[PDB]
Every structure is written in structure tokens, then in C-alpha cells.
Amino acid sequence: MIEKFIMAGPTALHVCDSQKGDKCVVLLHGYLESMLVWEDFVPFLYKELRVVTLDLPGHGISVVTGEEHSMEFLADTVADALRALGIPRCTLVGHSMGGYVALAFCERHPDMLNGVVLLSSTPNADTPEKSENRRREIALVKAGKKDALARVAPEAGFAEDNRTRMKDYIEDLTEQVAVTEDEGIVALLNGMIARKDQNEMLRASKVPQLFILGRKDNYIPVEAAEKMVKEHLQARVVWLENSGHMGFLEEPETTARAILDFVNG
Incomplete structure (x- = not known):
């Protein structure tokens, strides 16, 4: 991973980029995380794919712009960063709060x-x-x-x-x-309070979708997760039987395989 400080439009952004690979996966951390949360996970991906991580504004090493970082702002920041990196297309992986950013990105870009x-x-x-x-x-x-x-x-x-x-x-x-x-x-807390329901967007979207969901997740219990799955026939689902909210740390090879299989269609 090569560390970079770039201008994503008007917003400086801290990114790490493995550079090599004709297909690119971008990883978005969640709340009270940063790009560091992925450090042990990226080696499961970067031999086959170009891997990009970044610190979302408000976390890690990043800007703070105002009292709220809306999910749209965060998604637009990522989009501008990817264009500046010369990455026109990626598979975007969002962990929890990072998934809310990824949903706004799916809507807007x-x-x-x-x-x-x-x-x-x-x-x-x-x-x-x-x-x-x-x-x-x-x-x-x-x-x-x-x-x-x-x-x-x-x-x-x-x-x-x-x-x-x-x-x-x-x-x-x-x-x-x-x-x-x-x-x-x-x-970021104000941004998550403010975020929109994205279920209709997902169903309408032409973008292929994958859900990776733990079976022991305090934040997303099985019945909440099963209800989500049943509303999204278009999405593929991988269940992590021995993971909670942190599957890429709890079952890394299995989580990486889910992503790699998805990227290879």
C-alpha cells in the first residue's frame, strides 16, 4: 500500500493505494474506525486486485467541514478522489457507516x-x-x-x-x-442521524449488490438481517456464521473470498 495525500476536488483526502491491478476494490471503514482497520485485510485482496483505502472526513487523518458530514458529501468526496486517482470504476465495500456512504455513492455515482x-x-x-x-x-x-x-x-x-x-x-x-x-x-454522527432510507434506491439500481452479514452481530441481529435480505431479491448474500459486525477481522479469508468472487462476477 502506497500512502497518498490528494485533493479530492476541494477536500484533501488521506488514501492508501496498492496501485497494481486491472480491477479495483475500494474499502470504506465505519464509525470510530479509520483506514487502519483494514491493515490485516488488504493482503487477502491486493495480489489479485488494486486495493484503495481512505480516511473518511471526520475520522482518521482527515478534514472536518462544519457540524455535519452528510452521506452525500462523503460519497461525493470519494468519487472526486477516485477520479483524481484515475480509477473510473471500482467495487465499493462499505463497513457499517462506510456502507451508508457506499449507498449514497451508489445513488449519486x-x-x-x-x-x-x-x-x-x-x-x-x-x-x-x-x-x-x-x-x-x-x-x-x-x-x-x-x-x-x-x-x-x-x-x-x-x-x-x-x-x-x-x-x-x-x-x-x-x-x-x-x-x-x-x-x-x-x-459523522449528525450525518448518520440525517441519512436517507436507501432501500428503494437499491432495488432500482443497476449496480450489482452483495450483502456480507454476520450471524452473531449485536448491531444487526439475525431477524433484522433476514428482513433486509428478503426485501432485496437482486442482492447476493454471504452469511458469516462466526462473525458479528467485524467479519473482515473475525473471518478474513472467508470475507475476502466473498469479495473476490463478487468482483470476478
Whole structure:
């Protein structure tokens, strides 16, 4: 992976790019993650594909523009970055929050997609209860208590029975929170509160779709996931039997195989 700092239109962007490959996969991290979350996953892909990772505005090393980073803004930023990199078409893989960005990208820039992968993400809007909890997290951050976010989220994304095996990644994610910008967390939380329901968009889209969904995911329980699958006949589904929300760390070879099979059609 070659590290690059580029201008995506008006927005500086931190990217990593394996450069080599006639087909390209772009990986979008989720909430309280950054490009670093993919570090052990990219070697499962970059021998066959060109792999791009990036820090979404508000996370990792990135800009913060205002009080809200809308999913449209984030998607347009990625699109501008890909054109600047000379990548006209990619398979876009979005983890959770990254999947919400990937959905706005599928809506606004489908010409740039050979396919879209929702990796433990759904197309539903925020429930009222979730938005209330996001406002609670915004309030915690503004009060100087961002550290409180680091206590639960890093472990809760894993299947309960993988917490011991994944303890090094849980520590990685804990440390990621400390170097995530306060105002970026606020901007992205407001953006997720504001995001649209994308179910009709997906059904209407000509872009091939893949869902990768864990069977032990605290955030997306099986019955929520099965309801999503049944509404999207056009999408392929891969179930990760021993993963929660973090399948690319919990079952990396299986998750990578799902993506590689999808990219090769």
C-alpha cells in the first residue's frame, strides 16, 4: 500500500493505494474506525486486485467541514478522489457507516461502480432510538468525554465469543478513538442521524449488490438481517456464521473470498 495525500476536488483526502491491478476494490471503514482497520485485510485482496483505502472526513487523518458530514458529501468526496486517482470504476465495500456512504455513492455515482458491497450495513434510516443515542454521544464528546465512547464500541462489534481471540484488535480500536477528532465524531454522527432510507434506491439500481452479514452481530441481529435480505431479491448474500459486525477481522479469508468472487462476477 502506497500512502497518498490528494485533493479530492476541494477536500484533501488521506488514501492508501496498492496501485497494481486491472480491477479495483475500494474499502470504506465505519464509525470510530479509520483506514487502519483494514491493515490485516488488504493482503487477502491486493495480489489479485488494486486495493484503495481512505480516511473518511471526520475520522482518521482527515478534514472536518462544519457540524455535519452528510452521506452525500462523503460519497461525493470519494468519487472526486477516485477520479483524481484515475480509477473510473471500482467495487465499493462499505463497513457499517462506510456502507451508508457506499449507498449514497451508489445513488449519486453508479457509473463509477462495478458493484457495491454492504459489509454489516443496512439501507434503513436511523431509528428514533438510535438517533437519540447518537445525540447522547454528541453530548458526551462536547463535554470532553470522548473517552467514554472507547469503552463499549470497540468490543461490541465482535461476536461475543470472539472477544478473547480478537483482543488485540479491540485494543487497536480503543486506541483509534483517542486519535479521532472530537469535531469529526460529531460531524459523522449528525450525518448518520440525517441519512436517507436507501432501500428503494437499491432495488432500482443497476449496480450489482452483495450483502456480507454476520450471524452473531449485536448491531444487526439475525431477524433484522433476514428482513433486509428478503426485501432485496437482486442482492447476493454471504452469511458469516462466526462473525458479528467485524467479519473482515473475525473471518478474513472467508470475507475476502466473498469479495473476490463478487468482483470476478
